[PDB]
């Protein structure tokens, strides 16, 4: 092959590297940002620490932390608008990540 | 063979020697114009080091400093006009010898 | 009569390609070049013609693309598929105008 | 043809070799050895770039590295292979300059 092959591959693998670089930063922040949400506005009960002795995953945690937040601060009038039910017990996603927007609108107007 | 014949064989034999170094020196002012073009213009990722590092030829590497030339300064619709259209990817020649006389008046009125 | 029939098309796309660079070239360049005129100094069709593209290529194509891409800077003899290339780049630059 | 295909290769590469020695000879040396100057006073291409690359061993290669690689104190019959060698240190000498 001619080396414009390369000058399209060596510059994708790059570009992948780079986008991986960066999806890891954003987990990083997303990380931060779940530790900050729970020590300001959840109880202690709900640390990171006793739900992995209590045996769940990461992932596990920040969907209940975010479930949490949002059955505390958004009400049932824009639950049931979003995720049309009140309550989100077996519910994370998408709709989590907009009604979790919302909780953070919420407090923010609340402060 | 008669005197004449030889007189015009050596003549000729000498012609085509000098055309040969000719040859040679402008091959000479090419490398040195697309080394100066990739120091001045390009990144430093496209690299003769790491280009022939990566195992392509010399003329690879020229078409692929030219290629990125063009596409950095002379227009979509220049290339689609010139090149009779928009890839570059199979446009190495004579048509890209003038794509890069392009380039280089396009980076002369720039200055 | 297919034959024909494809020379009378061919006839018909240079002599769209004749009205079009005419239309443009009365517009952009000047009244004195104009066919009648220019017949009537003596000259043929398609001197007009090119006449008027080497005109346009001197009004719109810089004169450093003429010596660079053509390789002279005199069009006055540099009629064929460069004088094509440099009617294109003409027709790029008055877009672009 | 890909004979001459190949032979042109060949061209390439030995005149990607002379641009190399010429272009880091004019700012290492002197103008005095330009190539202009040196087909002024009479000497063939070959013999110019052998005359460069020994005036480069000179340079940067040390005598002990010319008389005991090359065998000779003289570079000025040693062309050849011990000649690439000498060259080769010549730009190693250079590179770590």
Same mark, same amino acid.
């Given at each position: 092959l001619s080396i414009n092959e390369r000058i399209t591959k060596e510059l994708a693998e790059v570009e992948?590297?780079?986008r991986i670089e960066k999806q890891l930063l954003l987990e990083a922040e997303r990380i931060n940002e779940i530790d900050t949400l729970a020590k300001a506005h959840?109880?202690?009960?709900?640390?990171?620490? &006793?739900? %992995? /002795? !209590?045996?769940?995953?990461?992932?596990?945690?920040?969907?209940?932390?975010?479930?949490?937040l949002v059955r505390k601060f958004v009400p049932i009038e824009q639950i049931k608008?979003?995720?049309?039910?009140?309550?989100?017990?077996h519910i994370d996603g998408?709709?989590?990540?907009?009604? &979790?927007? %919302? /909780? !953070?609108?919420?407090?923010?107007?609340?402060?």
């Open positions: 992948e590297r780079e959840l109880s202690n009960h709900f640390n990171k620490e &006793v739900l %992995l /002795a !209590k045996g769940y995953t990461l992932k596990d945690i920040m969907q209940a932390q975010r479930r949490e608008a979003i995720a049309k039910v009140s309550d989100i017990s998408e709709i989590l990540e907009q009604l &979790v927007s %919302l /909780a !953070k609108v919420n407090i923010k107007l609340r402060k």
